[PDB]
Amino acid sequence: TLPDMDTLRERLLAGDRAALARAITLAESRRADHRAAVRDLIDAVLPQTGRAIRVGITGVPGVGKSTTIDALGSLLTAAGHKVAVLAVDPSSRMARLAIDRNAFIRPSPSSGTLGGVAAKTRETMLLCEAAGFDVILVETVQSETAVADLTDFFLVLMLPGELQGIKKGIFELADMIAVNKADDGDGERRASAAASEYRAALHILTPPSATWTPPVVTISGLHGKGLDSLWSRIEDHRSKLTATGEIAGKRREQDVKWMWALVHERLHQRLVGSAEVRQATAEAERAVAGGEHSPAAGADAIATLIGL
């Protein structure tokens, strides 16, 4: 009734890409035993995970994120890395990387809650690491904090110059800002001028006791400029924060966060699993949003629905 998960596990650990893809396919099937088998497989290969650089990447639409990931991912595969690109979308391109046999690109997983989407992304990351991927890029497509809380290093891409340049509260979380579109000629001057502004703000906000002082750099994703320097900074961070234990410390905190997120996703699934409860939950939420009932009145109405 179930597939041969022992043999799938062995093939995956031996680097068989078909096995990695199949494990991810089984995790998104409608059968609960398929999903449980892949859960059990991930748990079984946990000791072979973690040996990767996990980089989160965000930026406003049009900044050049797809292009930059495509270019950076190709630079890394050329250099002997195996690169996974995982998207995170609460609503749940890269064409050259898409044909690269050492890259593995996946869209955002489906879940009831953004916590669930993000936590499923952690589980996919672990699968990828067990399968031998040593670079995990997680991109936003809210999702920004989730992606920072999924990765070791948070890279924010910015335009080289009346809206938010990036969502309020996200700039200060950057481990590096890369100002994109530093194209030959004036593009370089402009982006470098913009980098000087972001660099002033970020260094005002960075205490000298911080282990890592976030750099601000200029790049051209389109023309492949500045990407080696960018990556070298991520590797420097890995070395420095591995030395302090701060990468382990952050991962432990993230993993507990995603565990609780999945417990909350299980709760959410119980609340939308039947029409009555789904409607009653909606009504309570509407009453609170509308100022008709207090937040605790809505909460207790919902908690009683499922005997909590």
Ligand X SMILES: Nc1nc2c(ncn2[C@@H]2O[C@H](COP(=O)(O)OP(=O)(O)O)[C@@H](O)[C@H]2O)c(=O)[nH]1
Query: What are the binding residues?
Result: 62, 64-67, 139, 180-181, 183, 220-222
C-alpha to C-alpha distance for 153 and 230, rounded to whole angstroms:
12
| Least Cβ distance, residue 105 to ligand X (angstroms) | 13
Across 151-161, b (16+ Cβ under 10 Å) vs e yields: bbbbbbbbbbe
Q: Which chain residues interact with ligand X by CB under 6 A?
A: 59, 61-67, 93, 180-181, 183, 220-223
CB of 23 to a second copy, least distance (A): 13
Of 222 and 299, which has the nearer Cβ to ligand X? 222
92-100, 132-140, 182-190, 292-300 -> range binding a second copy (CB under 8 A) = 292-300
Query: Smaller CB distance to a second copy: residue 17 or 257?
Result: 257
Q: Which of 10, 40, 186, 235 binds a second copy (CB under 8 A)?
A: 40
Q: Report the residue number, 59 or 132, with the smaller CB distance to ligand X.
A: 59
Q: Dihedral (C-alpha) 23, 25, 26, 29: value to the nearest 10 degrees?
A: 170
Query: In which element (H, E) is residue 56 found?
Result: strand 53-58
| Residues β-bridged to residue 159 | none
Task: Tell the smallest beta-carbon distance from residue 164 to a second copy (Å).
Answer: 5
Segment contacting a second copy by CB under 8 A, of 65-73, 82-90, 158-166, 239-247: 158-166
H helix intervals, the chain: 5-13, 17-27, 32-44, 65-78, 114-130, 143-148, 186-205, 227-243, 246-272, 275-289, 295-305
Cβ-based neighbours of 106, under 8 Å, separated by 6 or more: 24, 84, 85, 86, 87, 124
Q: Which does 50 bind (CB under 5 to 8 A by kind): a second copy, ligand X, none?
A: a second copy
CB nearer to a second copy: pick between 78 and 308: 308
Give long-range contacts, CB 8 A cutoff, 24+ apart: 195-198: 198/158, 198/171
Footprint of a second copy on this chain (CB under 8 A)?
36, 39-40, 42-43, 46, 50, 119, 122-123, 126, 162-165, 168-169, 171-173, 197-198, 200-201, 204-205, 207-210, 252, 255-256, 258-267, 270, 284-285, 288-300, 302-303, 308
